[PDB]
Each structure stands twice: as C-alpha cells, then as structure tokens.
C-alpha cells in the first residue's frame, strides 16, 4: 500500500475539516520517530486536546492507524481514553485525543504491590470499559498494565487501541496473532477463531502483574513464553498466599483455557470481589509518588 493509496483510504474515513483553522495554542509535548504530539485548544469549546501529528511517510503498520480511526471514532465511554477527531492534514494524520496526566498503571505496579481495594478499583474501571466495548463487538487485543492510563484525580482509563478489531454478524470471529506475548490468550497464540474472550485472559494476566509485580514467564524469551502459554494449564500467582478467597475466585474466572467457560466482562462486573472497589482517591497518593 503506497503513501498515495493510504491517504486515499484515510480520506474516506477521517473527519472533514481542517484542524489548522480549528485549533490554537499549540505546545509541543512529545516527539517520536514518526511524529510529534502537541497540546492544543479547540476554538469554540475551549477543550484541551493532545494532537498526535503522524507523518504518514514515516509511519509503519499504517493499517493499525486506519483500523483505530474507523473503529473507535464512533465509540465513547468514561473509562476509555476518547478519540475526539481525526483529520488528514496534507501528508500527516492528526488524531485529537483526550489528555491525561496521571501516568500509566505500570508506573505504580512495577514498584508497589496494590492492595485488594486498589486492585478492585482498577479492575472495576477496566471491566466497565470492556463490558461496553464488548457489547459493541470491539475487541481491544492489547490489554496490559501500560495500556491502562490514570488521571491525577485517580480515574482509570483504557488506552492503546492500535490492535483493536470489530466483530460483526458477517465476520463474528478473528484469527490474527496480535497482542503482546506475555498477555496473549492461548487461542490467539494458536490462531484459533476467537472473539471478545481474549481480552478477559489478558486482564487475568494484568491481575497477576498487580499481585506479583510481573506477568508469568517474564524471564523467558517472548517466543518461549508464547509456547508455554499456548500449551500449558493457566499460570498461577507466585503470591497466592496473599490473596483473599474472593480475589482468587475472580482471577480463576479469567485465567480459563476454554473460552466458552471463561468469564465475560459483564460476569466479572457482577462478581463479589468488586464489592471491594474504592474511591478514585485510593489511587491518588500512589500516582503522585510514581
Ligand atoms: Cl489528568
């Protein structure tokens, strides 16, 4: 797919309009090998946005940018980092995103072992996002601690939709090997037909991150880890002694090989473990420390 064909594809799906007339008060806050990020203000609402300005001539895996724009433009949820607009601006794609300042969950969970109230607070938020996305037929496919972003006031939001997919009556299952090795569901690794259940497995691995500090098999090569995950009974907590019977049960609903037996996001929202959910404030001191 040439640069010219990709622009043509994007032209069909992006918002109309030219953000060079619509935004102001730009401040460069980031840069990468394929673009920059600027904070800016939307003129009539005053809203602050983070504008990813992607040089499509340098960008690779351009199909992922297309898929995220096409899929996520029409979904919104309080626990999902919102994509307000996307625009084709000459040779670049500008994507206007909700701006958050509390870092990523990994910043904290790499350093500290969350208590069960904190774990419940995080899981309840991610599960509200997933229950909404799954009901829409969206599969995230890259759930892991660093896909979870936080606000300074302790709100928990899901981000990093690069690998997302949309299922439909017509195409009800995916079979692509996508995601991040240590968090991939066994059926993804085996390239079986799969649907929204894979995000629940990944969430289970994230719970292990929260309790233990790292996912299973983390010292193995990513290829070796995938082989063990593909073949083996589900991985267990290293710190199993730490965890309440109710949290053990919650985790055991997630890390289930048989995707039909595995819990759905809605089942997990209804689980007694989430009776332990705290106020956003329960994360705020940690977010400030890390
Ligand atoms: Cl924030």
Do residues 214 and 230 both lie within one domain?
yes
**Per-residue tokens: 108:** 């904290």
Residue 231 Cα to ligand 1 middle (Å): 41
Other CB atoms within a 10 A radius of the CB of residue 229 amount to 26
**Per-residue tokens: 288:** 């400030």
Last residue of a domain, one of 99, 118, 150: 99
Do residues 81 and 160 both lie within one domain?
no
Binding residue positions for ATP: 29-37, 52
Do residues 87 and 126 both lie within one domain?
no
Task: Give the CATH number for residue 58.
Answer: 3.30.200.20
Q: What are phi and psi of 249, to 5 degrees?
A: -65, -45
Residue 285 Cα to ligand 1 middle (Å): 14
* Greatest extent of the chain over all pairs of C-alpha atoms, in Å: 59
Last residue of a domain, one of 36, 68, 99: 99
Binding residue positions: 29-37, 52
How many angstroms separate the CA atoms of 226 and 234, rounded?
Answer: 12
Do residues 111 and 72 both lie within one domain?
no
Residue 155 Cα to ligand 1 middle (Å): 8
Other CB atoms within a 10 A radius of the CB of residue 49 amount to 22
Do residues 91 and 110 both lie within one domain?
no
How many angstroms separate the CA atoms of 52 and 223, rounded?
Answer: 32
Do residues 280 and 143 both lie within one domain?
yes
How many angstroms separate the CA atoms of 141 and 198, rounded?
Answer: 7
* CA trace torsion 282, 285, 289, 290 (10° rounding): 30
Do residues 95 and 123 both lie within one domain?
no
To one decimal, the resolution in angstroms is: 1.6
Task: Give the structural domain span for 264.
Answer: 100-290
How many angstroms separate the CA atoms of 59 and 81, rounded?
Answer: 22
Coil/strand/helix, residue 135: helix
CB 205 within 8 Å of CB 182: yes
How many angstroms separate the CA atoms of 275 and 280, rounded?
Answer: 15
CB 33 within 8 Å of CB 12: no
Distances (CA, A) of 148 to 39, 75, 105, 166, 203: 20, 18, 6, 20, 11
Solving technique: X-ray
Last residue of a domain, one of 99, 115, 138: 99
How many angstroms separate the CA atoms of 103 and 233, rounded?
Answer: 34
Do residues 37 and 120 both lie within one domain?
no
Residue 177 Cα to ligand 1 middle (Å): 33
Which residues face 95 on adjacent strands?
52, 86
Helices 197-212 and 245-254, axial angle in degrees (round to 10): 140
Do residues 95 and 127 both lie within one domain?
no
Residue 150 Cα to ligand 1 middle (Å): 7
Sheet arrangement for strand 35-42: 23-32, 35-42, 48-55, 92-97, 83-89
**Per-residue tokens: 205:** 């691995």
* CA trace torsion 173, 193, 265, 75 (10° rounding): -30
CB 76 within 8 Å of CB 261: no
How many angstroms separate the CA atoms of 95 and 33, rounded?
Answer: 16
Do residues 63 and 4 both lie within one domain?
yes
Residues around the ion ligand 1 (C-beta < 5 A): 100-101, 151-152
Q: What are phi and psi of 258, to 5 degrees?
A: -70, 110
Coil/strand/helix, residue 156: strand
Coil/strand/helix, residue 194: strand
Other CB atoms within a 10 A radius of the CB of residue 29 amount to 12
How many angstroms separate the CA atoms of 37 and 49, rounded?
Answer: 10
Which residues belong to the active site?
A: 142
Do residues 255 and 149 both lie within one domain?
yes
How many angstroms separate the CA atoms of 76 and 132, rounded?
Answer: 9
Distances (CA, A) of 242 to 122, 142, 201, 245, 253: 18, 27, 21, 10, 18
Do residues 228 and 285 both lie within one domain?
yes
- Structural domain count, the chain: 2
Residue closest to 216 by CA, chosen among 241, 265, 181? 181
Task: Give the CATH number for residue 140.
Answer: 1.10.510.10
């Amino acid at each position: 797919v040439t640069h010219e064909q990709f622009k043509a594809a994007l032209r069909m799906v992006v918002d109309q309009g030219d953000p060079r007339l619509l935004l102001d008060s730009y401040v460069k806050i980031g840069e990468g090998s394929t673009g920059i990020v600027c904070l800016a203000r939307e003129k009539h609402s005053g809203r602050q946005v983070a504008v990813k300005m992607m040089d499509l001539r340098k960008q690779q895996r351009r199909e992922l940018l297309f898929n995220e724009v096409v899929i996520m433009r029409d979904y919104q949820h309080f626990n999902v980092v919102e994509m307000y607009k996307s625009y084709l601006v000459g040779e670049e794609l500008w994507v206007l995103m909700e701006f958050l300042q509390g870092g990523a969950l990994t910043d904290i969970v790499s350093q500290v072992r969350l208590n069960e109230e904190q774990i419940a607070t995080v899981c309840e938020a991610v599960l509200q996002a997933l229950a909404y996305l799954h009901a829409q037929g969206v599969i995230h496919r890259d759930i892991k601690s660093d896909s979870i972003l936080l606000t300074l006031d302790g709100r928990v939001k899901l981000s990093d939709f690069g690998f997302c997919a949309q299922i439909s009556k017509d195409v009800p299952k995916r079979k692509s090997l996508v995601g991040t090795p240590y968090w991939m569901a066994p059926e993804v690794i085996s390239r079986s037909l799969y649907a929204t259940e894979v995000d629940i497995w990944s969430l289970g691995i994230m719970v292990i991150e929260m309790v233990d500090g790292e996912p299973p098999y983390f010292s193995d090569s990513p290829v070796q880890a995938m082989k063990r995950l593909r073949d083996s009974p589900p991985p267990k907590l290293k710190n199993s002694h730490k965890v309440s019977p109710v949290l053990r049960d919650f985790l055991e609903r997630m890390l289930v090989r048989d995707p039909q037996e595995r819990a759905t996001a809605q089942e997990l929202l209804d689980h007694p473990f989430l009776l332990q959910t705290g106020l956003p404030e329960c994360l705020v001191p940690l977010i400030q420390l890390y």
